[PDB]
Structure 1
Amino acid sequence: AVVATRVPPTHAALRRPTIELEFDRAIEPGSVPHIVLRADDGTSVAVGPLSWLSDRRIAFAPRKPLKSNSRYEIMVPAGIRSTTGERSTHPLTSSFDTAPVTPPRGLPNLDGASCFINTALQLAVHSSALDDILSNEAVPPAVRTLLEDYDAASADALDAQLAAAVAALRATPEVPDSGPGQTLEVMQALRMPLYDTSSAAKNNADAIRHAPPNTKAFFLNSYPPLSYADLPNHDRLVAFDYSTGGHYVAYVKRDGIWYRIDDAQVSAVNEQDLLALPAFSVSIEIAIYR
């Protein structure tokens, strides 16, 4: 017998959005300089031919795939001119994000003790390193497959891919071949870039604040333990694990909405709910920023 599945290339779509810039005044088409998209790591993506939707609105697309779950700054050099001859003496700047706006998904736990694999995968998929995880061949292939088809897979196909991925993760050295484990083991199998706060600073918060540039994910192994409110730079906090005692859940933020994902249960949460999350066993162990 045969089973048919459809895998739409929507992730790659998220990597080549169609950006649109609307201006306060009518702009002269030939004043528009070359627009550059720039990332938090310094890399610049070029912008394709400009299409004018109105005397004020222009539309373009990155020349090359942008990174996933990454923030990008649109830089319009100085020199644009209005239809009245005015000029912009300053580079104009805006921003956007290559992340999904739809709500997170739930990953089943058919093992009974696969909480930690699911939580770690939830934190990784919402991670700025998802593209970097997906390119490392040393990573089990099935995990990469689950992480690329995450948002766009039938639940049935997501469930089969998850079974195969859990199988391949337990097959690794770092991860238990059976039974429960730790989020850190799965992240190490994923080759996720983390910043141990023991390296460096004296506490977790100071290492997060006084960390090298472009450090997004932190592993909190210093003292004191932190709660949600203690996490620095809340404006960029996008994911973090929470440990309820032999059970891991994920807290992941999408399009300004926080969600709590316990295996296959996605439930939306507000900031006040999060602020009640205590720190005591470490509660928050991995904190992922954008």
Structure 2
Amino acid sequence: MRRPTIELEFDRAIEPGSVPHIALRADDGTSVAVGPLSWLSDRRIAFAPRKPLKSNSRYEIMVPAGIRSTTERSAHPLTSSFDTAPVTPPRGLPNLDGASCFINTALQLAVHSSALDDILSNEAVPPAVRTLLEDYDAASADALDAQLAAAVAALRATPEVPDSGPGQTLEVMQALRMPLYDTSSANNATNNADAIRHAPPNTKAFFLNSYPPLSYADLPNHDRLVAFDYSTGGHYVAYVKRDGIWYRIDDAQVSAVNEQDLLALPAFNPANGSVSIEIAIYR
């Protein structure tokens, strides 16, 4: 999933030697080299990145200007973009000890975030947690269950997560060492929404600790939004986006949802006054 085969089909017939140093580029401009170019036809090349790609990250294929056609140079660089995130539906995480939905929801948001690879190589993160996130897509049902129980115990043993009983999803994020951008600490906003719209361009995860609390409809930049937690007061649920499709994950229960559903989620429970969305993940 992170070292895939990429093939590009050009409109005109391209002479070899005309095609330049093709490279993939991450969002911050970092270039990864590719291997040798395979010529499937005179208008179809195939290649793969030498070094593995970051998970849950957008990459840009650039064919630099100057691709010579058999007829003629290329005026502008040819650019295409893809994403290394999985497209299979997400998996459920059973609520084992009865009071871990805050741990389950937080892991769900972490495995769908661009910080995943940084979490997986952070030795301050408990290794049982890095094990579970590593094979989240590939593990069997019984292996995922056993790995989840190991990750819950390792998390509850850290100083950040309560040793038993319920919690808040932020506490698990602090144990994962996942850097979050606090909306209230922004230089240029006095509310949650404008703090996100005006964050530094490389910012991909937000902790909404300003006012007013935001509904899904108020979350800026729906195009690039991929995950967020939803609190009802005493329960946690994860919403994650894969292949353009939103899934609601209530612990072990995964279900597809419609955009119409998400625009009806309130910014807080009007009964107990508890905030609902505190973590927002973008790609």
User: By how many angstroms is 1:126 displaced?
Assistant: 0.3
Q: Which runs of 5 or more structure 1 residues have no equivalent in the other structure?
A: 1-13
Separation of aligned partners in 1, 2:263 and 2:144: 32
What secondary structure, in the 3-state scheme, does the structure 1 residue paired with 2:185 have? coil
Indicate conservation of the 8 Å contact 2:233/2:275, yes or no. no
Separation of aligned partners in 1, 2:13 and 2:246: 38
User: By how many angstroms is 1:46 displaced?
Assistant: 0.7
Indicate conservation of the 8 Å contact 2:103/2:152, yes or no. yes
2:156 to 154, 170, 180: 170
Mapped pair 1:133 → 2:126: no
Residue equivalent to 1:20: 7
What secondary structure, in the 3-state scheme, does the structure 2 residue paired with 1:241 have? strand
Q: Which runs of 5 or more structure 2 residues have no equivalent in the other structure?
A: 269-273
What secondary structure, in the 3-state scheme, does the structure 2 residue paired with 1:15 have? coil
Q: Where does 1:35-46 land on structure 2 (aligned, <5 Å)? A: 35-46=22-33
- 1:159-209 deviation per Cα after TM superposition (whole angstroms, max 9, x unaligned): 000000000000000000000000000000000111011111211111111
Separation of aligned partners in 1, 2:139 and 2:90: 12
User: By how many angstroms is 1:55 displaced?
Assistant: 2.1
Structure 1 stretch displaced more, 20-29 or 181-190: 20-29
User: By how many angstroms is 1:82 displaced?
Assistant: 1.3
Residue equivalent to 2:83: 97
Residue equivalent to 2:220: 232
Separation of aligned partners in 1, 2:59 and 2:93: 29
User: By how many angstroms is 1:42 displaced?
Assistant: 2.5
Separation of aligned partners in 2, 1:42 and 1:207: 24
Separation of aligned partners in 1, 2:164 and 2:60: 44
Give the TM-score normalised by the residue count of structure 1: 0.94
Indicate conservation of the 8 Å contact 2:14/2:68, yes or no. yes
CA RMSD, Structure 1 to Structure 2 (Å): 0.8
Structure 1 stretch displaced more, 267-276 or 141-150: 267-276
What secondary structure, in the 3-state scheme, does the structure 1 residue paired with 2:226 have? strand
What secondary structure, in the 3-state scheme, does the structure 2 residue paired with 1:42 have? coil
Separation of aligned partners in 2, 1:205 and 1:256: 23
- 1:82-103 deviation per Cα after TM superposition (whole angstroms, max 9, x unaligned): 121x211111110010111111
Separation of aligned partners in 2, 1:255 and 1:228: 19
User: By how many angstroms is 1:78 displaced?
Assistant: 0.4
Residue equivalent to 1:50: 37
Separation of aligned partners in 2, 1:93 and 1:234: 23
Separation of aligned partners in 1, 2:29 and 2:65: 20
1:251 to 236, 239, 244: 239
- 1:244-276 deviation per Cα after TM superposition (whole angstroms, max 9, x unaligned): 221111000001111000100110011111111
What secondary structure, in the 3-state scheme, does the structure 2 residue paired with 1:226 have? coil
Mapped pair 1:189 → 2:189: no
User: By how many angstroms is 1:30 displaced?
Assistant: 1.5
Mapped pair 1:221 → 2:221: no
User: By how many angstroms is 1:41 displaced?
Assistant: 2.3
What secondary structure, in the 3-state scheme, does the structure 1 residue paired with 2:17 have? helix
The percentage of counterpart residues that share the same residue type is 99
Residue equivalent to 1:67: 54
What secondary structure, in the 3-state scheme, does the structure 2 residue paired with 1:100 have? coil
Separation of aligned partners in 2, 1:276 and 1:20: 41
Separation of aligned partners in 1, 2:41 and 2:221: 38
Give the TM-score normalised by the residue count of structure 2: 0.96
Separation of aligned partners in 1, 2:244 and 2:11: 26
Separation of aligned partners in 1, 2:20 and 2:144: 44
- 1:20-50 deviation per Cα after TM superposition (whole angstroms, max 9, x unaligned): 1112222112111011111112221111111
